[PDB]
Design a protein around this nucleic acid. Structure first.
Ligand code: ATP
Ligand code: MG
Ligand code: ZN
Lengths: 165, 614
DNA sequence: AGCAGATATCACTCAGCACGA
DNA sequence: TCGTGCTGAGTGATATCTGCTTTGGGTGGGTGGGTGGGTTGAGGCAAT
């Protein structure tokens, strides 16, 4: 399925349950962006500059605040580091949020349509063609923004070292 | 008079022969230049001189027979535009005519020039023509029946090539009654066996036997070709086409090589079964290839010597090795010394002393360590890239497998064996099988791999250096604990590396700022990679340094001093062999045949810095 | 249905003689 | 020693009839082989 995802995002579900062989395959996909086959039958190497979307569950099934974030994550720390952005989503009980969620789900079940009426969703076709246009586009950066990014990097490095203490 | 015509057309063979002879006899590249709208690039010597006459003369001088023809040159000449169109439409007959005409002109050159070259040798040769550049290249998916028996161009990647297949040319028959022999030619693969003995006196019918080993054969090979990645419209499985190559073109392209092939699109019936003349409706398509293309000198030695004479050669090589890596001078120097390597000693009475150098790259994951391995691979003339516990890689040890293609037992050599005489880079040393660790220990101890499985008892040479990388157990390397605990490797295996480098990403404002500046700018001369590889190859092939008395004294004094530092043992005898190897490698780098005090001083310093980390 | 082995009935070559030239 | 039949049985030859067997799959077997194909699923075993 990775080949079909070449030059495109990969939608992987149950990421933690994946076997170690596929873990090594995705590791090769990320670090090298290449797919290599070494078999007697055939030997073909196909380039794979494909992004990955991963969904996983904690080690215990649910996140444990007592344990450190690394402990809750079964995957190797190197794989987590290689990920550009990691989003942690949790379900915290609350009267207001639960009530709104229940109302939304009930309305969806009854009327078979989006309950929200404050705003009208944009047409999917427009969104996808806009995304294609943006992909076709090429930006550029200056030296001042480079210096700003350098300053942000040193600040973030100091903050992250202090946090990792 | 008998008038010879190509079947199904109205083209006279005599006209084609005379046109091709005239084209070959008189043709200049200036015609091609004017045709290509490059008339203003015309010079006065090469473009005004006969081209194919010179080609034929050079071919006679070198003794070769095959001639490469550019089809566009036919269009560049007024007479042969019809010949070019015919070649595009009727390739087989035109090619045969071209071959015969080439032989005719080759003999006529000697006849007219009354040269001293032997004619009998020429008369007994076979000549061929290999046209190329016959138009835009089509795709494997655009080949319709209309293109059958026509000349096509196809670009793709080679996937496999069968062994050489003997193809019959002339059949040799023997009489069972009179011991009389006769050779009968083969047409369309049909042997024209005589009905009876050709001898008047011996007219014995039906007594002719075919002697298989006394017949004339040719070379044939079948190759599978896959369309290039850009030809795939959506991303489905790329299609493939079968190619056939005969004679010189055999073994002209290995697996995994991207090639461009010119040939004839042919269709052949397939028999339903082996018992009968019955044929399948559907025909199989393939390409009869006629041309295949793949897509140290005195001056080089002078340049190498000039570079060696440069004072700042060490720094220049260190910079050229890793231009994109910032502030790792010591690691780059160690890598350079490993690449050049030490002197291999073949001792009588002593055995074998290895001249290789092993370096371990361990430290924090943030720092650049895999890029260094990739650079080393790009530089080393011989080597393989591998990661421990990696299915994609071929493997680190030799193994016995089954050839799926052929259903045959084959002994396949591992990555370490294939790296004999080079540098083997192992990306992920931390995670590795026990078996693989034992194989690595054996390779780094005995330098040979032994396998006694599948009824095979053999030993394979593995005289290769190792440049491995490692990561700590946790998210970072803890300075408080010793290196052995952090790297998570056996003390024995960790004590065999000559140089151990601990590149640590300590949080320092200055270092972080400089690294950020370097990285953002990525968005002292440097040597090209090719020249560096050539220099390394020449140094490893020719120069062999030898230790001198001053080097002996310096080495002894340095070892004694290092031992006296520490009861704690600061250094062992291994730290002396490592110094000897490093000094020999440094002497190799300067293209010196004698190890001097400077090399020993450099060696003690590189060895000491790693020990200080330890 | 196609293929390989076999039977038997189909001609053709060298054989040679009578007449006469 | 040429020409023209008549005789002729021998030496062919070619136009002409009599019996397999096959595909592939257990409606030929395991004293035809497993390197001529089939062949994915369950089961037991040793190294791990
Ligand atoms: N001195 C340096 N100069 C340039 N880039 C550097 C340097 N040190 C670190 N980097 C950057 O650090 C990153 C390290 O990537 P690399 O592939 O080498 O990681 P690695 O050592 O294999 O990591 P891991 O142990 O997590 O697998 C690269 O982006 C490299 O640009
Ligand atoms: Mg790495
Ligand atoms: Zn004979």
């Amino acid at each position: 399925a990775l080949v079909l995802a070449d030059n495109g995002i990969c939608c992987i579900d149950e990421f933690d349950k994946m076997d170690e062989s596929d873990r090594t395959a995705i590791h090769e996909v990320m670090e090298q962006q290449t797919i290599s086959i070494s078999k007697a039958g055939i030997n073909t190497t196909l380039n794979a500059r494909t992004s990955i979307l991963a969904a996983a569950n904690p080690l215990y099934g649910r996140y444990n605040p007592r344990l450190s974030p690394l402990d809750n994550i079964n995957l190797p720390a190197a794989l987590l580091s290689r990920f550009d952005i990691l989003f942690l989503m949790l379900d915290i009980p609350s009267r207001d949020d639960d009530e709104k969620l229940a109302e939304h789900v009930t309305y969806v079940h009854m009327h078979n349509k989006q309950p929200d009426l404050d705003f009208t969703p944009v047409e999917p076709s427009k969104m996808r063609e806009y995304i294609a246009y943006a992909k076709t586009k090429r930006p550029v950066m200056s030296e001042a923004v480079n210096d700003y990014v350098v300053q942000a990097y040193i600040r973030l490095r100091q903050d992250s070292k202090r946090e990792m203490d | 008079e008998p008038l010879r015509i190509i079947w199904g057309t109205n083209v006279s063979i005599q006209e084609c022969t005379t046109n091709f002879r005239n084209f070959l006899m008189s043709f200049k590249y200036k015609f091609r230049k004017i045709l290509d709208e490059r008339e203003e690039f015309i010079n006065n010597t090469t473009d005004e001189e006969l081209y194919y006459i010179k080609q034929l003369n050079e071919m006679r001088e070198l003794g070769t027979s095959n001639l490469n023809l550019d089809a566009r040159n036919l269009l560049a000449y007024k007479q042969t535009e019809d010949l070019y169109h015919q070649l595009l439409n009727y390739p087989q007959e035109v090619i045969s005519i071209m071959d015969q005409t080439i032989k005719d002109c080759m003999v006529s050159l000697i006849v007219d020039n009354n040269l001293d070259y032997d004619l009998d040798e020429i008369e007994t040769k076979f000549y061929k023509v290999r046209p190329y550049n016959v138009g835009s290249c089509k795709g494997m998916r655009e080949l319709n029946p209309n293109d059958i028996d026509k000349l096509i161009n196809l670009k793709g990647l080679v996937l496999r090539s069968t062994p050489v297949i003997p193809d019959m040319k002339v059949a040799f028959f023997k009489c069972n009654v009179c011991d009389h022999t006769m050779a009968v030619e083969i047409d369309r693969g049909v042997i024209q066996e005589p009905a009876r003995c050709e001898r008047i006196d011996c007219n014995e019918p039906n007594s002719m036997s075919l002697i298989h080993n006394r017949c004339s054969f040719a070379d044939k090979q079948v190759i599978k070709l896959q369309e290039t990645p850009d030809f795939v419209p959506d991303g489905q499985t790329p299609h493939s086409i079968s190619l056939c190559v005969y004679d010189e073109l055999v073994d002209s392209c290995r697996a995994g090589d991207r090639i461009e092939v010119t040939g004839t699109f042919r269709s052949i019936p397939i028999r339903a079964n082996s018992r009968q003349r019955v044929l399948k409706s559907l025909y199989k398509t393939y390409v009869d290839v006629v041309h295949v293309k793949k897509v140290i000198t005195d001056q080089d030695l002078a340049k190498i010597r000039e570079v060696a004479a440069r004072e700042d050669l060490y720094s220049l090589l260190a910079r050229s090795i890793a231009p994109s890596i910032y502030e790792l001078e010591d690691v780059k120097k160690g890598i350079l010394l490993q690449l050049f390597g030490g002197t291999n000693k073949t001792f009588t009475k002593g055995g074998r002393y290895r001249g290789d150098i092993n370096i371990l790259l361990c430290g924090d994951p943030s720092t650049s360590k895999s890029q260094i391995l990739q650079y080393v691979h790009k530089i080393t003339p011989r080597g393989v890239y591998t990661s421990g516990k990696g299915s994609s890689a071929v493997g680190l040890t030799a193994y016995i497998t089954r050839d799926v293609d052929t259903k045959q037992l084959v002994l396949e050599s591992g990555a370490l064996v294939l790296s004999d005489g080079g540098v083997c880079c192992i990306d992920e040393f931390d995670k590795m099988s026990d078996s693989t660790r034992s194989v690595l220990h054996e390779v780094m101890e005995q330098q040979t791999i032994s396998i006694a499985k599948a009824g095979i008892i053999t030993t394979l040479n593995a005289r290769s250096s190792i440049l491995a990388s490692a990561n700590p157990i946790g998210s970072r390397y803890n300075p408080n604990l010793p290196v052995t605990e952090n790297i998570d490797l056996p003390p024995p295996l960790l004590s065999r590396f000559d140089l151990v480098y601990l590149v640590l990403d300590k949080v320092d404002e200055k270092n972080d700022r400089e690294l950020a500046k370097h990285l953002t700018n990525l968005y002292d001369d440097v040597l090209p990679v090719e020249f560096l590889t050539m220099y390394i190859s020449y140094a490893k092939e020719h120069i062999h340094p030898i230790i001198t008395e001053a080097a002996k004294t310096e080495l002894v004094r340095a070892y004694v001093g290092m031992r006296k530092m520490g009861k704690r043992i600061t250094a062992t005898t291994r730290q002396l062999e490592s110094m000897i190897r490093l000094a020999e490698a440094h002497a190799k780098m300067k293209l010196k045949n004698v190890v001097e005090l400077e090399d020993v001083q450099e060696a003690v310093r590189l060895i000491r810095s790693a020990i200080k980390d330890y």
